[PDB]
UniProtKB/TrEMBL annotation, chain E:
This is DNA topoisomerase 2. The chain holds residues 563 to 804 of 1192 of the full protein. Type II topoisomerase. Processively relaxes supercoiled DNA. Displays DNA-supercoiling activity only when associated with the viral histone-like protein. It comes from African swine fever virus (ASFV). Belongs to the type II topoisomerase family. The active site is at Y238. It is found in: Host cytoplasm.
Amino acid sequence: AFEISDFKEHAKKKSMWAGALNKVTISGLMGVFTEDEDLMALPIHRDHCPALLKIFDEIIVNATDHERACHNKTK
Amino acid sequence: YSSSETIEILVKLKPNSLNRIVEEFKETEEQDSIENFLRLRNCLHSHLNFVKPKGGIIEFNTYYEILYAWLPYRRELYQKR
Amino acid sequence: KVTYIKISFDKGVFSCENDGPGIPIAKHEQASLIAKRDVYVPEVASCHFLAGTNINKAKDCIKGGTNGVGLKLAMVHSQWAILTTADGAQKYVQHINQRLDIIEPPTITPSREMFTRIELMPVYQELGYAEPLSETEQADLSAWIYLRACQCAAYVGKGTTIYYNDKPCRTGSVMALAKMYTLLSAPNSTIHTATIKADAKPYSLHPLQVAAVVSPKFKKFEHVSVINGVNCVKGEHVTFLKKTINEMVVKKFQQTIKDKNRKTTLRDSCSNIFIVIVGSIPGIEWTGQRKDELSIAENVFKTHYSIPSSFLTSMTKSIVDILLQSISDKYTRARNAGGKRAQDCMLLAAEGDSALSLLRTGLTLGKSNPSGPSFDFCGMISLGGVIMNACKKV
Amino acid sequence: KTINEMVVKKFQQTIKDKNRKTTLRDSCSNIFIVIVGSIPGIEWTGQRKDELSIAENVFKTHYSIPSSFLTSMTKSIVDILLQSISKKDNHKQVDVDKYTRARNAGGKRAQDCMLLAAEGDSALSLLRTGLTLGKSNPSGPSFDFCGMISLGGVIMNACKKVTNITTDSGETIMVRNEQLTNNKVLQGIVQVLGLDFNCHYKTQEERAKLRYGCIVACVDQDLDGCGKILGLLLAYFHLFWPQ
Amino acid sequence: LIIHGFVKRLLTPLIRVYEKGKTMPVEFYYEQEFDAWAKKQTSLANHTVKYYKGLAAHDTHEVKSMFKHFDNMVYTFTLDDSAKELFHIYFGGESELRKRELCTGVVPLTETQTQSIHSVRRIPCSLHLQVDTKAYKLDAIERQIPNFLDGMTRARRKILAGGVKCFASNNRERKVFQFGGYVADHMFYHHGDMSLNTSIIKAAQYYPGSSHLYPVFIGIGSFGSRHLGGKDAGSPRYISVQ
DNA sequence: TATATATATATGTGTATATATACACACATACATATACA
DNA sequence: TATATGTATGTGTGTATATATACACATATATATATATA
């Protein structure tokens, strides 16, 4: 059967947008952990959802985009 | 410390280990504990399988059979010489 | 069934044709309601983004397709294209031009053929190429497509021939692929082979075929993967093989070395390996439309798959040989060995080296023996004394 | 690639082996780099933006890596490369081939031990027969103060596989050949006696650092063995340590 | 592939005999065939028997006459259905099948089978395993197991006969390789030289725990000790026997 | 294009070291695969 | 958590089968390596 999808349902079903929509092994996955006033970058040896990290990432890069866009400006 | 034709082997033991050898490598009445420790017996196990004249294997059970098979050939050889 | 996939690339035009059931020649209701005119299924399949038969993929589905996007990506990068498809009662021809801007109405006739053909001219100039293609661009692109077809020929089933520019594609086995990739770095080399099976469905339905070469003149680890038909370049299947081989290599290296202290890692273990992995894996996901990298939990392989130990042992042996080597024959090839008249040839396996002296004396009577053999169809090799028996060692 | 090109150059410079070939994995496997900033005109391989897409020549044409950074990096990397050249390939090994050490080699009575260097292995069979006269020869030697090693047939001569380099300081130096360096017999006997090539052994507290303090060549008496290889052995010890 | 004709072999002479005058030799392929032939004769005073040990002992006119008829003398193996049991008997890991078979001698070859082999030019694998492999295994039992009368094998019997013949005039010492050349010439030994010299060395040895308690020879030189099991002798250019 | 290295091959008569493979069987060392459990 | 229990390797003997390698010695030739010229 040939189906036509909209953006919404597509993005919920398809991994092409943000990565896998379930937990997979992400090679090089790191996080920052505090050990007595010291930041350490440590590996996270546990599967996680790439799309879940992407929704954080998309907003964060929108913010840093705005920062560059305004850095030579008045406001 | 062996000679050219005489055996002389010298081991050294770490202290307080003879009694562990005696209680750990057990003694039967066929071999000692020290001989069980130091590999000091073997079995003389035979496989008496020869070839016979005019070709072919022959298999004996004891050395007396080989002697009793050997004697008449020498007897007849004296008669013909 | 699909009995053939004909691919061609000539004068810039690119074409691909398969012979299973065609695309349904039928009106698409919802697509027509959207378009307010008559739209048939091939037009949706080729011109409607996010549309296809894989929008709702099953967890066991091993098709590469998932997004309903790829075909329209081909159309959007085509100056002109022709979709032709026949279902045994009708044939359907639709022309899709100007990067999906001109979609001509289709032409539907009776036909008893059954097939699907996409034929198109890319926008080479818009994409950075010469118009028409230069000698080098043409040769590069032909070589690359030819390679992709060889990969298909190893991935596709056994009733399916892959053609490129009408010649059949030779490489129906991962061993053929391994030999193709290593013909120069390491000709005449040893090919370790394994079929990696799983015990639980769906994975047990899809064994992975593997061929690996191990050479001191390989500078880094290298793999070729066809997974679900996709030539992807990154995925935890590779890491599964790498880690397994490494664990065995470390064990036997510390065994064989009487140094007993040195610590080697995966780079030492694997930098002399070239591996081809071909097959299907159900339930995988990708990192984008390109499908460069598959996404999966590593434990899928730890739980379900096992690498045959004979392959692991062979591999570890070759690798540990190289490791110790880094720390510190008698075959006259016939002129026609492995070519078009390869089955016309003999191999005179002699027992030593004095025997080869006799045979090389004999096969060179050029005009004292005009009806005899010669090295055009005869080789020589030494049996090395007495052959090992395999009946007591298997 | 930039770091690798510099690392290869300085590795071949610093190494006097001058033959080994290292690639990018050797160059870079000990590196952790952080790169932060903006690049105009890049493209990606998907929405996720895992991989940026660019022509390599953008950097070859436009960018330059400061040489101080390249130099620092190459220095650290080649230090590790030479450490791995002193290790790995050259790690802990074992005794030499057809060699029977004495019980008192390199110890408190190291100087009073002999090395009976023989010509092959049938001679070592004779010497093993004779150094084990247990109580039939109380005045003879045994393995408490005697060793055995084989000379491998005919010794290589060093008097014509070596070159003099008169240094600009004035004191000339004597560099061996790669063939003479890689001979198994001579490497074995300079490993056994603990010799050194930049020690002239002129005083006695530097001759007390030999593993045992005399060599005795037990060779044949035909002219092939008494004249030839005994002469080449004398020539080797003349050319390197006449003291 | 044994079904579909992939394993082939040549077929060479083992003994050629040359008649004085005539220009064709008589070629025998098995040794017992020649022995039964040569026992039938009454006057072999002008024939020259040539034994061809390996195939590299073949002269130039002989290799020319063997390579004019190359495809005339290649054979091909055909696989039977009874062959699996014979391949399991001769080369399997169970020895008692091989004891039970190898009592009786080799079955002679019939006339119909001979004409079929030489005419249609193909070989059944079972008919090969029950002649060639079985004849080899009986030969290896003859060479590697002693006779119960004298106690010595075939090689040591040749060595004792050649030693009685060699040292007859005076009991002057020889080397090992020179005495080995003598006993390979006059006792018609048809094998290699390294194994014969090893046999002479181990026949001369005498130490506590050696094989022989009453050796045939007096050994003069270094003949090994108890410690390495007699595997630490000299090379055969050094040591002597008497 | 030049003057200059240092390593590299081949010939006869000599000096020295080796190594896989078959074949039988009593014996030694390595797990490992369960089966009660715990 | 100890126990057996059926797996798999592994040298070793005599008589066979087939090979491999280091060194010395003289002199003519060689193919790439090197300064400094510039």
